[PDB]
Amino acid sequence: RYLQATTERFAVAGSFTISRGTRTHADVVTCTIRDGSFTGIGECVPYPRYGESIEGVTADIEAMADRVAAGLTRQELQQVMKPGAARNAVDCALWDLEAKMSGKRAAEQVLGQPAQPLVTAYTISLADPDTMAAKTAENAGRPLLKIKTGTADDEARLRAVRAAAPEARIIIDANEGWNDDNIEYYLKLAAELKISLIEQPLPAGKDAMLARIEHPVLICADESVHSTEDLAGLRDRYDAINIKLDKTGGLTEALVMKAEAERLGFTIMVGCMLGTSLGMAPAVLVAQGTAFADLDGPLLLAEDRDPGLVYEGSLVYPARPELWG
Ligand code: NA
């Protein structure tokens, strides 16, 4: 049994912009683990917002080579590695390899039954209002649109997209882009516009005001989410959480976190980094039965894994073993 780390670049379909900046490609790292004729693979996305780099993640993965060769388990893996991109890759590769070797689908092991299709959000990138309105209008038939915001003047943006898709459920994500001076104005505007959810309006660690104002729209933590442990402390500010496998350091911890978030009464969104179908596949399993799923990574790319996940409109079908699981 041996392990390899591989870096791959995927072109974005145009550009992907949040309040923090623009991406024109998606660099991902895969951990491949082989055991005889069997192979497991896991994808991750290093995220510099969380202090990660591609070389850093690859180093962290390649350092697991001997431990994995020795027979490391997912269970022990949760002790040797901290949560983050690197562990995500290793963890999902083990889930994969274990499925291939056993003949039992990762889905069934996680869910106690086969996974099922589900509706994914589709993300409209932050740009000038006219542009965002135009892309929103093209996608006005989708049941769930996720809109990137997070500037000191988003009114034109928010008004334009609602008008372009009057029938869509809409969630807005500021990626820490709003502040104490404009938040109440934006929530009121969002409620007038029938917005379903707002992701991370205020910067992580500068978000105390959320505990002292009405929430006319449910407010979801993303950047502020830091493993199962700090969930309980987030209740005073947030109504929902965005679970990501690159944040939880893999599928194992994502399921733990989902169980605890549900115990604490959080509304659950399962999200993703800008990655491929390989990265989406395990997250589809965590997204079963949750209020929101944001797994549109491959739809934002110009080139995805072949084979990849099937998306028909906004319904994404669960991974077949030719891809993962
Ligand atoms: Na987000």
UniProtKB/TrEMBL annotation:
Residue ranges constituting the Mandelate racemase/muconate lactonizing enzyme C-terminal domain according to the UniProt record: 129-220
Stored Pfam families: MR_MLE_C, MR_MLE_N
Residues annotated as the enzyme's active site: K148, K244
Annotated L-glutamate binding sites: Y47, K146, K148, N175, K244, C272
Cofactor note: Binds 1 Mg(2+) ion per subunit.
Keywords, sorted A to Z: Isomerase, Magnesium, Metal-binding
Classification via CDD domains: L-Ala-DL-Glu_epimerase
Entry cofactors: Mg(2+)
Entry annotated with the keyword Hydrolase: no
Residues the record lists as binding Mg(2+): D173, E199, D222
Alphabetized InterPro entries for the sequence: DgoD-like (IPR034593), Dipeptide_epimerase (IPR034603), Enolase-like_C_sf (IPR036849), Enolase-like_N (IPR029017), Enolase_C-like (IPR029065), Mandelate_racemase_C (IPR013342), Mandelate_racemase_N_dom (IPR013341)
Gene Ontology molecular function: any one: racemase and epimerase activity, acting on amino acids and derivatives
Family from the record: Belongs to the mandelate racemase/muconate lactonizing enzyme family.
Full protein name: Dipeptide epimerase
